[PDB]
Structures are given as C-alpha cells and as structure tokens.
Amino acid sequence: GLTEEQRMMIRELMDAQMKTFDTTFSHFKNFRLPGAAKWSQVRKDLCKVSLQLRGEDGSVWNYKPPADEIFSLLPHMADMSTYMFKGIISFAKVISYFRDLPIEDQISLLKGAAFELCQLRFNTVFNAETGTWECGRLSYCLEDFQQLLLEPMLKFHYMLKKLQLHEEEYVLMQAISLFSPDRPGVLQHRVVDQLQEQFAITLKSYIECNRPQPAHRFLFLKIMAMLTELRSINAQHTQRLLRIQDIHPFATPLMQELFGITGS
C-alpha cells in the first residue's frame, strides 16, 4: 500500500546501501592491531571485547585484552571507525535528497549522524545468540552477565536486534537519523525536517503494509524510540571520546574532521 513516491524512496535508499555497505568488510585492510580526576574519569570512560582474525588459509589469531595500558585498543578502533565513516559518507552522497542540500548542511548532518549510522550498520552484523559482531574475517566478541547489558550501547544492540527488522527498515532508520533537522549548524532546517517527516511516514507505511502480526504492533513507535536512545548514546559517547582524545590522542584525520578538531 505504498505510493509510487514511497516505493521510489525505498529503492534509492536500498540502492545506496547496496553500493556503499561492504558487508563482508573485504576492503578493510592495513589496520593497526594491539601490540588526575580526568585520568580517573577517562579510566571510567575506557571500560571489553576479544578480537578474532581468520586468515584466508584458515589460520586464526585471537586477542584477549588486559586489566587495570588501557590505550592499546584505540588505534585499531580508530581505523575501524574511519573505515565505517567512509562508507557512511559514501552512503549519503548517493542519496539524491542529500546531495541536493547545500554543502554546509551536508557536512552538518554527517557530523551529527555519522556515529549513529555506523552503529545501525553494526547491528546488522551483530549476533545476539553469541554476543559477537561478525565483520567478515574480523570478529568482536563480548567476554564473559545481566550486568553487561547495563552498558547502554550493548543494551541498544540487543534491543534493536530483537525487533527482527528488514533491510528496508534499517536503511529508513539510517535516513531518519541522517536527516535530523536539529543537528548543530543546520541551515535548511525546514527542508531537512520535511525530508525527515517523509522518511518516517514511508517507514510507518511500510510496517503497516508488510507486518500484520501481533508481535509487530507499535513497531514504528518502538523504532522511533530506539532512534531517540541512539542519539542520546551518540551524545554521551562523543563526550567520552573527546575526554580520551584530550589525554591520549588517537583520532584519525577523518574523525578529527567529523569532531570539528582543527589541529591547532
């Protein structure tokens, strides 16, 4: 029961996702690997995942992290974040509604939503039965707990996975997050707001036309609630990373650009 405009809208988003989301991570290469009240808070900020690399020959490398030193993981994390940020940026540039915005609003929207779209893409490779993010030959496993789900990002991934979303519903979440009219520095707030409203209406219509089961009652509102939580997680995590960056630099040039770090 979608209109022609709504079907075309989903087609372009799915087209952009297919072109820019390397679900096997085959082109993620050459990445680095692990070899006073601020440092206190940064110690609280720092804290748990094992890393597995499966070679093409069949060999396997595993890394288990240390206690307390806590910075051995940041270069790899920066490289993964940078790789995912590049895919998110390519995703936005293909979308016609995005590249018709002025370049200053494109930058403002990408600065505000890059993290959120990365986590949404990571949820599609999350395995809730094994607690692992399967990124091709890379795997990030949660180490051995109802106390673990207290962590808001982990709780997000478990709750979003439980909703059993389609590929089309994920890319519409990505569009709704991307076209947030209230990111800092957005000028065409009225245009972005009307674009966001139409992406949300398309999602609402898609769910009503394709999910009649009682388990999917209120699904649209559950998804919208997840996006609000993801934005709150985004804000807390950005302040976490900026405190760590202040104590121990790690941000790549691309992450610096997205964080507004000038280099002086």
Q: Is 121 annotated as a binding residue?
A: yes
Binding of residue 187 to ligand 27H (CB under 6 A): no
**183 annotated as belonging to a binding site for a ligand:** no
Q: How far apart are CA 117 and CA 20, in angstroms?
A: 12
User: Contacting ligand 27H (CB under 6 A), which of 8, 47, 149, 153?
Assistant: 153
Q: Is 216 labelled a binding residue?
A: no
Return the residue of 86, 137, 237, 243 that touches ligand 27H, per CB under 6 A: 237
DSSP 149: G
Least Å distance, CB 167 to ligand 27H, is 19
Considering only 29-37, 60-68, 150-158, 207-215, which stretch makes contact with ligand 27H by CB under 6 A?
Answer: 150-158
Residue 61: which H helix or E strand, with range? Answer: strand 60-63
Q: Is 237 annotated to bind ligand?
A: yes
User: Using the rule CB under 6 A, which residue among 2, 46, 53, 77 binds ligand 27H?
Assistant: 77
Contact 41, 241 (CB under 8 A): no
**Dist CA 256 CA 264 (whole Å):** 12
C-alpha–C-alpha distance, residues 107 and 258, integer Å: 8
In whole angstroms, how close is the CB of 262 to ligand 27H at the nearest point?
A: 23
Q: How far apart are CA 219 and CA 162, in angstroms?
A: 11
- Give the CA diameter of the chain: 60
User: What pairs with residue 50 in β-bridges?
Assistant: 141
Q: Determine the Cα–Cα distance for residues 88 and 106; give it in Å rounded to an integer.
A: 12
Least Å from the CB of residue 86 to ligand 27H: 14
**132 exposure class (CB count in 10 Å sphere: 0-12, 13-18, 19+):** middle
Kindly tell me which residue out of 6, 17, 20, 81 binds ligand 27H, with binding defined by CB under 6 A: 81
CB of 135 to ligand 27H, least distance (A): 8
Taking CB under 6 A as the criterion, which residues in 88-147 touch ligand 27H? 122, 133, 140
**Is 236 annotated to bind ligand?**
no
Kindly list the residues in this chain that would bind ligand 27H in the complex (CB under 6 A).
Answer: 49, 77, 80-81, 122, 133, 140, 151-153, 157, 237
